[PDB]
């Protein structure tokens, strides 16, 4: 029993910022990576990003830009912020525990809804 | 990053039926590659990792297969719990793409 859930602001206006929280529980975030992923409505899996046990952030090339992943260990939570949103920023997002080339434990995910 | 492609996008089956899944990189992955499936209103569940390995608790009816850029994912008589999406990922070098997936309905 890991324990990840997401908690973020459903309805948000197009040009804000999003903040996203992944809240861990069983597991220390010194010794997995915590990956980003988000689901448009019908649609695939997209891969946002991850930052490792030390720190370290990986991010998906296109959209780099408008993103940023931190943690805090203390707190064990990990956070996801975007930048100025587009309607197509509409998506369930969730965060993901990585141990060994697979992504084991899972949040619910968290249905962001970009409206103005 | 590389991409993955995924076929068919869906498909219809009957239970009992097999299935195979495949997923294509755009690139040499060697191996790094896990599938996981999807149902309704729930978060991914992992199936397969590192191409052949089965999760804790998979049933035996799921196999993965590939290497290189040519990966599948095969359903031996598929139980009505089995539909629902599937969706490979790699985890080479520094991006963790997922293949568009592919969706298995009831018949």
């Known amino acids: 029993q890991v324990q990840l859930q997401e908690s973020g602001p459903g309805l948000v206006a197009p040009s804000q910022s999003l903040s996203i929280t992944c809240t861990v529980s069983?597991?220390?975030?010194?010794?997995?990576?915590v990956n980003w992923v988000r689901q448009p409505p019908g649609k695939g899996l997209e891969w946002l990003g991850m930052i490792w046990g030390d720190g370290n952030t990986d991010y998906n090339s296109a959209l780099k830009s408008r993103l940023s992943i931190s943690k805090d260990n203390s707190k064990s939570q990990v956070f996801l912020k975007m930048n100025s949103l587009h309607t197509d920023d509409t998506a369930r997002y969730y965060c993901?525990?990585?141990?060994?080339?697979?992504?084991?434990?899972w949040g619910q995910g968290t249905t962001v809804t970009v409206s103005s | 990053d590389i991409v993955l492609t995924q076929s068919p996008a869906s498909l219809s089956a009957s239970v009992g039926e097999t299935v195979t899944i495949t997923c294509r990189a755009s690139?040499?992955?060697?191996?790094?590659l896990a599938w996981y499936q999807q149902k309704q209103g729930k978060s991914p569940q992992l199936l397969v990792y590192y191409t052949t390995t089965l999760a804790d608790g998979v049933p035996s009816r799921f196999s993965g297969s590939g290497s290189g850029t040519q990966y599948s994912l095969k359903i031996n008589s598929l139980q009505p719990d089995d539909f629902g999406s599937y969706y490979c990922?790699?985890?080479?070098?520094?991006?963790?793409?997922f293949g568009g997936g592919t969706k298995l309905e009831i018949k």
């Open positions: 690139g040499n992955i060697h191996n790094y």
């Open positions: 993901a525990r990585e141990r060994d080339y697979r992504l084991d434990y």
């Open positions: 069983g597991f220390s975030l010194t010794g997995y990576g």
């Open positions: 990922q790699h985890f080479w070098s520094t991006s963790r793409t």
